[PDB]
Enzyme design. Structure first.
Site, mmCIF file in Angstrom:
data_model
loop_
_atom_site.group_PDB
_atom_site.id
_atom_site.type_symbol
_atom_site.label_atom_id
_atom_site.label_comp_id
_atom_site.label_asym_id
_atom_site.label_seq_id
_atom_site.Cartn_x
_atom_site.Cartn_y
_atom_site.Cartn_z
ATOM 1 C CE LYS C 41 -4.125 -1.954 0.060
ATOM 2 N NZ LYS C 41 -3.806 -3.290 0.601
ATOM 3 C CB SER C 271 -2.955 -11.396 2.180
ATOM 4 O OG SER C 271 -1.926 -10.426 2.228
#
Lengths: 4, 310, 310, 4
Positions: C41, C271
């Site tokens: 991100k 993830s």
């Protein structure tokens, strides 16, 4: 402080 | 550019100019938290294992043993996992559950020692384990293993030279094992030939390098700047290449790390705050106005440095 | 190579070949945890702010507002600090003290919403704040802002192309906002012209992309793979460039992340485990034997992924 | 799961  | 294992992905850390420290942008930081295991120790963990492999001291089947559960132990744990070595780390049973879970998660055989004996207990236990089968166990000895400053002379130093196009004038680094300041200084001064000012940083609470060089009585003491201030002069600290020694107190190191986070958006550890605090002091002296000061930030923090943490 | 602020140091993350996954080394991972703020991100946080500056929507004095306290909020917080912007993030009061201290440590004006309203409450509150002075506040909208996949098309994708000398054949990526798989796929397929296989990964517990493409009833559900499985098809997921969709369960994603840590010495999030689990499944099919599979590991973990964590 |  030897736990470096 | 596909690394064969995670130990080869060390380094090539970025230099970022500080906006709220220094004078006219003369302070630039090297972010070692941008590494595997989140600290500068990934470099020495990788190179001490690689050098032990090259010199035959570490072979397939022998195991690594050490008494550090700090950044070096974490680094050795990652390298051991990445290269297929068993590793046992001793540590006082009073260490945090988080640190224990992290080392176990990395595959470490964790040996807990008596809380009341502290680091002395863990170190003695590690030595005991190696003594039991010297041909089976290898203790890499970060405070004296030359592979420590050597990796900094071969990577960290050249990276600074390259990223500053040879313009670096001052290097500021906190001293724990002394490998960083030693290797970087040897690279820039000896290999690249630039007579820069090398600045060691230590806690004002345990200023053993300052006391030593001044010929004063050596009086180590407790402090909270984790990672530096070991209370003695390590064999990996080359005092001959140190030009200046700056002392910083724990509270200021903490406040500085917090400012790096809130004002620069840089997430670094308390010792990074200590190094920047020392660098900022020099950067605001007229004599260092036109000089480029590169500061090593040894580790990252994934958390705000709360009082509980410090 | 001195970055003007920490937002410019994003990317250039390493590719590491896995030794205990895949067939004959056909699985390589891209470690996005090796970034500012410790996750992929950082790229979109940087580019959404940069694009808002270039298009005039974000000026000196306007403030950023959002309802994410996840990796994107942390990324926006670092970029805001690094570039001098005020930022307010809304979040349920039930979020961890650690996450709160981290955002506050980054300079965020944290607005806590009613625990009982969850993410719906925080999102509604963020919208309320912007509505109160639309000319003062800017919400960047990560699920639909094109600057999200664009930064992946300009950096992440080209990095994969470069580091594999154009040999990448398959890209595997978990889908949260869809920006990563979209931008990377556009770069490699459209800009570099290689007809690779793009694989989206989602939780078997909330397989909305699989349900959608199969024309089945969309039934999102709860899962523990944080970062992916948003329960809807985001505007930043370009379904047209997706060739395959693999589902992975939360337990396996967790076990896989733990194996990355203990067997490869790679510290990644749940993830990342999901993506590697999906990639490993394809890598062991004869059809993918001679293919180079690149897997995005979205974030790092500074801790062992305990049950409490998952 | 929007808290991404």
């Amino acid at each position: 402080n030897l736990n470096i | 550019a596909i690394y064969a294992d995670n130990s080869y992905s060390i380094g090539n850390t970025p230099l970022v100019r500080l906006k709220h420290f220094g004078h006219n942008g003369n302070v630039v930081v090297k972010i070692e938290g941008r590494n595997p295991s989140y600290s500068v120790k990934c470099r020495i963990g990788a190179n001490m294992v690689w050098q032990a492999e090259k010199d035959g001291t570490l072979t397939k089947g022998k195991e690594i043993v050490d008494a550090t559960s700090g950044n070096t132990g974490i680094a050795l744990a990652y390298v051991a996992a990445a290269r297929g070595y068993k590793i046992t780390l001793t540590m006082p049973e009073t260490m945090s559950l988080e640190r224990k879970r992290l080392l176990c998660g990395l595959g470490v055989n964790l040996v807990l020692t008596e809380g009341a004996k502290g680091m002395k207990g863990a170190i003695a236990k590690a030595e005991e384990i190696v003594a039991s089968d010297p041909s089976r166990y290898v203790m890499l000895k970060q405070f004296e293993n030359p592979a420590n400053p050597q990796i900094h002379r071969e990577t960290t130093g050249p990276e600074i030279w390259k990223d500053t196009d040879g313009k670096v004038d001052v290097v500021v680094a906190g001293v724990g094992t002394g490998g960083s300041i030693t290797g970087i200084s040897r690279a820039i001064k000896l290999d690249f030939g630039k007579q820069i000012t090398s600045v060691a940083v230590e806690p004002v609470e345990s200023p053993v390098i300052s006391q030593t060089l001044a010929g004063e009585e050596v009086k180590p003491g407790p402090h909270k700047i984790q990672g530096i201030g070991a209370g003695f002069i390590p064999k990996n600290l080359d005092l001959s290449i140190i030009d200046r020694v700056e002392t910083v107190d724990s509270d200021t190191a903490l406040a500085t790390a917090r400012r790096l986070m809130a004002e620069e958006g840089i997430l670094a550890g308390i010792s990074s705050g200590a190094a920047v605090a020392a660098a900022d002091r020099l950067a605001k002296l007229p004599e260092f106005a036109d000089k480029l000061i590169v500061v090593i930030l040894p580790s990252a923090s994934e958390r705000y440095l709360s009082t509980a943490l410090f």
